[PDB]
Design a protein around this ligand. Structure first.
Ligand SMILES: CC(C)=CCC[N@@H+](C)[C@@H]1CC=C(C)CC1
Ligand SMILES: CC(C)=CCC[N@@H+](C)[C@@H]1CC=C(C)CC1
Ligand SMILES: [Mg+2]
Ligand SMILES: [Mg+2]
Lengths: 354, 354
């Protein structure tokens, strides 16, 4: 603890950007801004509705902040899905993100989940009521198999949050707990399966590719975040339980051993990501290659992860990592750094109030 | 490999039985036969119903054989749940087992899964129709959290079977595939969460214990089966995709290296199983301790796994392992070896025909 392993999280970072073949960029600053606003505008209007405004107990500023964070992530990572697809996914991923804010015990609202579900009665928990109502707008872009994947992962995520409320990092010696919890709320199968709109792909035709992509992308996606993320949590305990911190508590190892473990899985998931899809269907490899780069581009740009600080304290160095850290860093900014004022407007609150 | 790793097998097996503290219990044969018949009787009557007889496309003999295999597993492992609970779980686990028999492509029957579900219209796929109809009888024995777990795992399992239809062992270099598939159809969270009936336990009170148990049991349960199963799935050219066989195809290692890998995870899951729950709530450790032993007892007794063959071949060897194994086996038999004629009757077909 204390004093960030500042270099390893640069080297590792470059190792990652190199492995994934951090080519240049996905869009052109204007294509991004174009999508950003399209997605944001549809979402903002959605969450601004009376019903949504009522059932979704969340602080306005938080909602605004979250919506904007999700839209960016989607628009920069699902680089090849229609504008509509970006938007709808953005609504769904905003719902999931906003659910992490609930402090309300699910228990009582989940006592009749299955009977209500099976009988088509509106769910008790208001979140389920909204998400299941909105789901068709997401699900329409996909085939039956990929849809099943989104449905499951979202269910898994609901359980994931329930567990998170107990702020439990696992019993010492419970090695299987950390990843069990990480998968539970990583939305991995939701992400990986949403990368294949039936309009651009055919599940039946690319079933083995898609299935393999879901399998592999799930871990790359969660671990790449856990890494980039380790910065805004190295100093924050208000987020006590985390894959790295749970490894420590569960596997009984040092924060460094834990952070080392993650770094090994991450670089490895990367190496294999490429080894498998490089020679596969071009369109497939392209969606994958783009999601990775976009995903990394987003982490480096969203103020959220405060990665700009790592920039500051590493702009004058002359290493073969401290430079490979900003050589890429900058690349991200030149195409992904965009002032919200250019796309995120008007504020959800304003639309809602109207 | 060419010949079975008998030596290696017998050892691993003992290390496993030792690690988990495999010892005789107070669950008497009379008690077993009593439960066996109770569960079987209720199930048989269930599957013998006209509707079940219609919608569940399965060969009678296979159904008979499966029902009997599932009842035994349940009754010998959920040693502390009510007779009714053993029965109901037996119906559910029989449904799941019988689904592996379908070659029918799920795709067309799953094109409207979510819309039908959300609207409360009977599912298109007949299996979902039956299982979701019968679900409340299982779910009544549990609290909301544990129920959510059963619901998810079962969904996961349905997808697991869909993937299995493609008889795909993973693309070479796709290390994440094997376990992805194994978890998908291991029903781990269904098993682990069904161990805590709300009549004997309180989710809210033992939440951390239960959650941890689900996380840990999932891997112990699937790997312990993959191991015991190894002897029968060795010379079965019919059995192509399996965790061990997929490790070979996916991780590009030898069948021995793969088998070796499994053996390490298995023994390890075991040690940690004990290290964690030994000092926890007595009732918890007891349900866990019993499930493991019962589960192992069942594998050694069910003719299915043809384990009696390794026994005979070794029963007259003055080896450290060999003899250590043979006694464990004998123990299992003396309490778990029971003639079907003592509990499984009349045959489902007969009841159905009536
Ligand atoms: C979008 C964020 C905050 C992080 C990326 C990591 N994923 C595992 C996310 C988990 C939570 C949601 C809502 C979506 C995907
Ligand atoms: C019960 C058999 C045949 C094998 C053990 C492997 N487990 C993963 C089972 C999968 C099928 C069910 C219903 C329960 C758990
Ligand atoms: Mg979060
Ligand atoms: Mg994180």
């Amino acid at each position: 603890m204390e004093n960030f392993p500042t270099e390893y999280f640069l080297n590792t970072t470059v190792r990652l950007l190199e492995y994934i073949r951090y080519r240049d960029s996905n869009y052109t600053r204007e294509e991004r801004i174009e999508n950003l606003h399209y997605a944001y505008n549809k979402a903002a209007h959605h969450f601004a509705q009376p019903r949504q405004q009522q059932l979704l107990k969340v602080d306005p500023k938080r909602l605004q902040a979250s919506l904007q964070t999700i839209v960016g992530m989607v628009v920069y990572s699902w680089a090849k899905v229609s504008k509509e697809c970006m938007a709808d996914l953005s609504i769904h991923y905003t719902y999931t993100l906003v659910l992490e804010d609930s402090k309300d015990d699910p228990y009582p609202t989940m006592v009749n989940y299955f009977d209500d579900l099976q009988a088509g009665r509106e769910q008790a928990h208001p979140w389920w009521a909204l998400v299941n109502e909105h789901f068709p707008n997401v699900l329409r872009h996909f085939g039956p198999f990929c849809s099943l994947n989104l449905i499951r992962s979202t269910l898994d995520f609901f359980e994931g949050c329930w567990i998170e409320q107990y702020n439990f990092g696992g019993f010492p010696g419970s090695h299987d707990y950390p990843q069990f919890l990480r998968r539970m709320n990583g939305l991995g199968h939701c992400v990986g399966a949403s990368l294949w709109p039936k309009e651009q792909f055919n599940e039946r035709s690319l079933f083995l590719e898609i299935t393999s992509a879901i399998a592999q992308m799930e871990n790359w996606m969660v671990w790449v975040n856990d890494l980039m993320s380790f910065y805004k949590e190295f100093d924050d305990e208000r987020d006590q339980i985390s894959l790295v911190k749970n490894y420590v508590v569960s596997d009984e190892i040092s924060l460094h051993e834990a952070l080392e473990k993650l770094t090994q899985d991450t670089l490895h998931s990367s190496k294999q990501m490429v080894a498998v899809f490089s020679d596969k269907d071009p369109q497939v490899m392209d969606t994958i290659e783009c999601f990775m780069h976009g995903y990394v581009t987003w982490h480096l740009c969203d103020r959220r992860y405060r990665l700009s600080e790592i920039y500051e304290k590493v702009k004058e160095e002359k290493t073969e990592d401290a430079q490979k850290f900003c050589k890429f860093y900058e690349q991200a900014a030149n195409v992904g750094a965009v002032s919200p004022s250019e796309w995120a407007y008007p504020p959800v609150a304003q639309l809602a109030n109207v």
